Amino acid sequence: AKECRCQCIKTYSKPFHPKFIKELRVIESGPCCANTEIIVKLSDGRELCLDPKENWVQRVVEKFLKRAENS
Amino acid sequence: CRCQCIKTYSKPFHPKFIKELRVIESGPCCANTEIIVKLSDGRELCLDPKENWVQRVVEKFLKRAENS
């Protein structure tokens, strides 16, 4: 399919500081993708897919969310 | 480079139908942080990131999605 399918072919495994994140996307698992997908947009203009099951990823997404909620 | 929201949604809905979450931080495109959630029914609602109930709903969805 085109729209109904997983959006990530691979995830970025190298940990980085949430300060480089400007946008976050969280797509829960369901009919169109067996797994939850997390895509972040960096200030370098890159769109990265992250592993939602990785602890550092969860902490990084948490820190960005709280900061954005303060702006 | 514009805002994705005109007005924020305040009417009651069941969070359990949220299937996707989007958070765009403020900057050159939009002065305020924007929070957009996609409901199963396809609807897209803009929520106020400054409201405490909103922050709780977003948090709960995130943890649930991370459990999959």
Swiss-Prot record, chain B:
Effect of K60A: Decreases heparin-binding activity. Impairs heparin-binding activity and leukocyte transendothelial migration
Disulfide bridges in this chain: C3-C30, C5-C46
Protein name: IL-8(9-77)
Name of the gene this protein is made from: CXCL8
Residue span relative to the full protein: 32 to 99 of 99
